[PDB]
């Protein structure tokens, strides 16, 4: 299937690479449930006119909690310990590790996370429906073509790469359109609100860029380097979790802070 199952069935996993990976993944959906409560409880702190952004964050948490829980359970019960060798190996009587849960979660979250900014800042010369369509199209295509390259990950590396680059073309359009959005949104508002906007732009840039870095991770030290191992498995799964907390939770907190800042007058 994937590089994970390859390692789980060629070399297997050490006790620590298995446990660590399960612990970080558990932490991942535990944070989503925490955020879900944060965004519901604080929805009263923002004016009626920005609340849609709290609403969109609440829903992202519901799906992120739900699907990252599935993934977590999917990693723990796909490998079983072998007393003879002392590692964890892919269990042929299980379901095999499946990263589909996480791609499904992106296909849902991406439109919302992109849509919700447009309820906090105001455009100037760009049209709302124009920006929204461009966000929804390129973001959908970024995930679909990423999913397709994800199949060739362990077999045909070249297709894994050509498809990853296509998905990168859509990624950069989004980065261009969000650039234009944050600029127009800075026009008018107070200097404090521009400060928050700039933070949001810095965070949006890093947090989304971690994702292709975790897509490629087991190849960044070569077709037989240090990461082509349970360590790249470990590391790709740590970067995703860092990325999920950044692009889903912290992003939405900053938008709420921005909404609040924009009610001073």
Ligand X SMILES: CCCCCCCCCCCCCCCCCCCC
Ligand Y SMILES: *C\C=C(C)/C=C/C=C(C)/C=C/C1=C(C)CCCC1(C)C
Contact assessment for residue 30 and residue 69, using Cβ atoms and an 8 Å cutoff: no
Q: Does 56 bind ligand Y (CB under 6 A)?
A: no
Q: Directed axis angle between helix 100-117 and helix 251-261, to 10°?
A: 10
Q: Is the CA virtual torsion 249, 215, 111, 106 positive or negative?
A: negative
Out of ligand Y, ligand X, none, what residue 230 binds, judged by CB under 5 to 8 A for its kind, is none
Out of ligand X, ligand Y, none, what residue 182 binds, judged by CB under 5 to 8 A for its kind, is none
Q: Smallest gap, in angstroms, from Cβ of residue 6 to ligand X?
A: 19
What gap in Å lies between CA 146 and CA 108, rounded to an integer? Answer: 14
Binding site for ligand X (CB under 6 A): 30-31, 34-35, 37-38, 41-42, 59, 62-63, 66-67, 70, 98, 100-101, 103-104, 107-108, 111-112, 115, 143-144, 147, 168, 199, 206-207, 209, 212-213, 216, 220, 235, 238-239, 242, 245-246, 249-250, 253-254, 257
Q: Smallest gap, in angstroms, from Cβ of residue 113 to ligand Y?
A: 5
Out of ligand X, ligand Y, none, what residue 66 binds, judged by CB under 5 to 8 A for its kind, is ligand X
Q: Whose Cβ is closer to ligand X: residue 81's or residue 210's?
A: 210
Q: Smallest gap, in angstroms, from Cβ of residue 15 to ligand Y?
A: 29
Helices (H), 43-89: 51-76
33: number of Cβ within 10 Å: 16
Which residue, chain included where needed, has tokens 């045909």?
Answer: 156
Q: Does 218 bind ligand Y (CB under 6 A)?
A: no
Distances (CA, A) of 151 to 4, 158, 164: 12, 12, 11
Report the residue number whose CB is nearest to ligand Y.
Answer: 146
Count CA atoms within 13 Å of residue 187 on its CB side.
9
The mark string for 231-260 relative to ligand Y (x by CB under 6 A, - otherwise) is -------------x--xx------------
Q: Whose Cβ is closer to ligand Y: residue 60's or residue 90's?
A: 60
What gap in Å lies between CA 109 and CA 238, rounded to an integer? Answer: 19
Q: Which two tokens stand for residue 209?
A: 């860029």
């Amino acid at each position: 299937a994937n590089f994970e199952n390859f390692i789980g069935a060629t070399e297997g996993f050490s006790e620590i690479a298995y446990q660590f990976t399960s612990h970080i993944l558990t932490l991942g959906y535990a944070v989503m449930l925490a955020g879900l409560l944060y965004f519901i409880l604080t929805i009263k702190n923002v004016d009626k006119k920005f609340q849609m952004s709290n609403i969109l964050s609440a829903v992202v948490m519901v799906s992120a909690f739900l699907l990252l829980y599935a993934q977590a359970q999917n990693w723990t019960s796909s490998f079983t310990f072998n007393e003879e060798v002392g590692r964890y190996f892919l269990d042929p009587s299980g379901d095999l590790f499946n990263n589909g849960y996480r791609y499904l979660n992106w296909l849902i979250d991406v439109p919302m996370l992109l849509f919700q900014i447009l309820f906090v800042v105001s455009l100037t010369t760009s049209k709302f429906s124009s920006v929204r369509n461009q966000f929804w199209f390129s973001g959908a295509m970024m995930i679909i073509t990423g999913y397709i390259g994800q199949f060739y990950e362990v077999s045909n590396l070249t297709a894994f790469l050509v498809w990853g680059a296509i998905s990168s073309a859509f990624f950069f359009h989004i980065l261009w359109v969000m650039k234009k959005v944050i600029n127009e949104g800075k026009e008018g508002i107070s200097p404090a609100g521009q400060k928050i906007l700039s933070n949001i732009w810095i965070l949006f840039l890093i947090s989304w860029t971690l994702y292709p870095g975790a897509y490629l991770m087991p190849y960044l030290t070569g077709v037989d380097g240090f990461l082509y191992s349970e360590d790249g498995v470990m590391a790709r799964q740590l970067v995703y979790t860092i990325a999920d907390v950044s692009s889903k939770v912290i992003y939405g907190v900053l938008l709420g802070n921005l909404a609040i800042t924009l009610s001073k007058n």
